[PDB]
Amino acid sequence: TNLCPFGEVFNATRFASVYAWNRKRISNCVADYSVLYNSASFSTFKCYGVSPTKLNDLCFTNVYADSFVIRGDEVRQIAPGQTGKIADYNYKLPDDFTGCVIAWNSNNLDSKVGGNYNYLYRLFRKSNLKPFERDISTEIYQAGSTPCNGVEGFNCYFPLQSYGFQPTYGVGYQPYRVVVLSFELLHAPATVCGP
Amino acid sequence: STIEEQAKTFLDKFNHEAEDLFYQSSLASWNYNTNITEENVQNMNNAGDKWSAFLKEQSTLAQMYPLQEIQNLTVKLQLQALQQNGSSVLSEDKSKRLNTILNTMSTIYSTGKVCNPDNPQECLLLEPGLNEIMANSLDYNERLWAWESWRSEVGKQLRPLYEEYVVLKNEMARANHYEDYGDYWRGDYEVNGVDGYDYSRGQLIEDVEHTFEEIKPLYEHLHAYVRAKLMNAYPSYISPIGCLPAHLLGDMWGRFWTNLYSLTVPFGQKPNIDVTDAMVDQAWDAQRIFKEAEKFFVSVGLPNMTQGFWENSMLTDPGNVQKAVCHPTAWDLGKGDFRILMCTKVTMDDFLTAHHEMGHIQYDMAYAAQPFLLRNGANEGFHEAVGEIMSLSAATPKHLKSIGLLSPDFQEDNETEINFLLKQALTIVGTLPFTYMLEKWRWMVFKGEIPKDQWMKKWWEMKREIVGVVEPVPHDETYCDPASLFHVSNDYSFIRYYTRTLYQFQFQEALCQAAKHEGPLHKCDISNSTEAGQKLFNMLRLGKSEPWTLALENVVGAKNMNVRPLLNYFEPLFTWLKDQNKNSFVGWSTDWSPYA
Ligand SMILES: *[C@@H]1O[C@H](CO)[C@@H](O[C@@H]2O[C@H](CO)[C@@H](O)[C@H](O)[C@H]2NC(C)=O)[C@H](O)[C@H]1NC(C)=O
Ligand SMILES: *[C@@H]1O[C@H](CO)[C@@H](O)[C@H](O)[C@H]1NC(C)=O
Ligand SMILES: *[C@@H]1O[C@H](CO)[C@@H](O)[C@H](O)[C@H]1NC(C)=O
Ligand SMILES: *[C@@H]1O[C@H](CO)[C@@H](O)[C@H](O)[C@H]1NC(C)=O
Ligand SMILES: *[C@@H]1O[C@H](CO)[C@@H](O)[C@H](O)[C@H]1NC(C)=O
Ligand SMILES: [Zn+2]
């Protein structure tokens, strides 16, 4: 009767920036997925492949919990086959994604009068991300043909940009904390079931 | 990577950078306009200075991408708009000279005072001092004193500054490859590279003059009826065939004839519709006023006001100690933040202004998904036209009865309709010759068709000829009377008030047709009609992303400014005016003046 440490992920003091998204591996524990789905504290709870309705009646080899912060209008990009700044440059889900996406508004925590610049996102990248890839590089993006020499200037821009969350922003620009549960199945012990 | 691909990336950095600096500048500006303190002045000036400096930098960086090599038109629009910024085209010295002239002229206008004879301590400013005289006084001599004193002690200060202001502005406009500064202003209506929707700067002059010709018959009869009524009240001061004296027009310049209503009301035994008493009887507050305005836009299919709007706006006067700038304004701070600043009182006028200001908000919300540089009305006249048609529908007796402010036992008779349309014509129609003539004079001055030693001679030749208004005192070339108006001395284009007036009645006529309105156009209420709201929204969400010719077509089915809906609005008055002036002279002689 070892309970999974979901509280460390959902109830964390600070979330990661989406470009530097976090991943906690979950193993050898009992997980109560019914508590999450029937908590009503979340504005988004969509599952793909698996169903939210009492699917604690299954077993998986490992569960990965990815957490980050984005703005409200970008939550729709945390989904299979979506494009945009987040889905192409920060955090990409695969087409065959089997798991759930959980999000809730966090204006009460991640917004400050005058701007909270702790949370960043990737604005430029030479190519799109493969699914579940992470890029934390701070190399200056070269948009022209002249080398940048590690500083920003003409056609040379530092790639990471900030949200600057303010409490008086619109819901579409307010911070949302996101948890992405990945469910993995290998020819393996399957050490996470939960009744 | 091509030049265009570099430009798309450059605008991506700009949008996200500007979006952030604009929000900080608007927040600081909002905090002062709601809590007026010294430290809030400092915060605004800082955030505003960083916003301006960021624009100067990005405007320079934008020029390094040459427009000839861009093909995506929506990209070229953003690149072009950022590039045209006149600080980095003139020399540093000449730009410094111009900004000093502009600031001095603005200061003279806002601090200029006039002191009555025999008492050099009892002085008056333009606002509220001289404006009260020109708006309420019936005494001929008092009005003449205020009119002349303003132009002889503040206008004469502005004359040397305006001459140098014209010289420097033309140099900046010519260096930006325009003919003159007036040509630069007409560039707001320019459209290129879109087949079937293009529009040249010169075509604006022809379309304004072509449409003004059709306005003349209605203006001539309104001018004639007003002259006859004024002559009854001032028999020794007004010629039955001459122009109207300039100081007897309801305000300092005769821009609007609104305050002539008391002396020109056709049926003075029939009172105006004024629901202010009913609002107080039902204990309405400001929140109820804006809740009803929100209800109005919902009824046509437009979205709710955002939760931030109710929490962040200021819809009442803050109090005694806390001071605010009470001019009603609609704020689009960006990042989804929409607010209205308004010191609302429980009155019919503030009830209608709320619909006007919330109409601005709906436009701001509708194009919020556009790129930052395209978040604006299709041209300079679109935004104000949208706001005006909201107060048109909300003020009708049809609308006021449905919302329980006008009793069901009030029936409009053709006399209160004529009273209403004349009051409308005094403001809406009376301003059109004033607006056209003023901007025409400025266009010719920038073009060079009027030499300096004939500025004032030509200014009053056109006032007599076009507006039918005559100066009460001869003015030599030490005067600068156009500069005695805010827009001329504070460097704002003026033709927008002419084009907007024609746009708004084109909008209202189209939306009432979609609403299946039966009757005269001025009684229409577009409430409860989603077809009208959908037709309006199709243009609102465009912003500046499409040519204004196409955006206008989305609402009215025509590609150009049209004066017919305006005349359709005032047809009941026009036939009444023509019957009124059957034994009156229609037109005016330009050689008569009150100084014989
Ligand atoms: C995050 O913290 C909240 C608050 O402590 C947890 O919700 C509580 O759950 C307990 C039962 O374990 C209840 O007794 C409390 O009433 C709940 N409070 C609230 C405010 O919900 C929540 O379970 C935590 N998150 C996770 C993933 O465990
Ligand atoms: C303006 O007023 C608010 C309360 O309405 C107050 O908290 C704030 O400090 C004031 N602003 C300044 C700059 O003094
Ligand atoms: C212009 O560029 C935007 C984004 O780069 C693209 O979505 C749009 O389709 C382009 N328009 C044309 C006409 O190519
Ligand atoms: C506005 O009303 C609609 C229903 O017409 C509702 O769905 C929406 O949530 C409301 N929005 C706000 C901000 O109240
Ligand atoms: C709009 O429809 C509502 C719903 O029936 C009605 O109460 C109201 O009087 C209508 N107003 C107008 C102006 O048609
Ligand atoms: Zn307005």
Author numbering:
A (entry chain B): 333 to 527
B (entry chain A): 19 to 614
Paper text:
The binding of RBD to the receptor hACE2 is an essential step for virus to entry cell, thus we first explored if the binding of six SARS-CoV-2 variant (including Alpha, Beta, Gamma, Mink-Y453F, Mink-F486L and Mink-N501T) RBDs to hACE2 were changed in comparison with wild-type (WT) SARS-CoV-2 (the first strain of SARS-CoV-2 which was isolated from a clinical patient on Jan 6, 2020, GISAID: EPI_ISL_402119) RBD. To further elucidate the molecular mechanism underlying the binding of these SARS-CoV-2 variant RBDs to hACE2, we prepared for RBD-hACE2 complexes and obtained five crystal structures, namely Alpha RBD-hACE2, Beta RBD-hACE2, Gamma RBD-hACE2, Mink-Y453F RBD-hACE2, and Mink-F486L RBD-hACE2 at a resolution of 2.9 Å, 2.6 Å, 2.8 Å, 2.4 Å, and 2.7 Å, respectively. Each complex structure was comprised of one copy of the RBD-hACE2 molecule in one asymmetric unit.
For the detailed mutated positions, in Alpha RBD-hACE2, Beta RBD-hACE2, and Gamma RBD-hACE2 structures, N501 is located in a loop structure and could be replaced by a Y without creating folding problems, it seems that the N501Y does not induce a large conformational change. Some very weak hydrogen bonds are possible between N501 and ACE2, but the phenyl of the Y501 side chain could make many new favorable nonbonded interactions with hACE2, i.e., a cation-π interaction with hACE2 K353 and a π-π stacking interaction with hACE2 Y41. These noncovalent interactions in Y501 variant are stronger as compared to the WT type. Corresponding with the binding affinity, more efficient transduction efficiency of pseudovirus particles of Alpha and Beta than D614G strain were observed in susceptive cells, although our assays were limited to pseudovirus viruses.
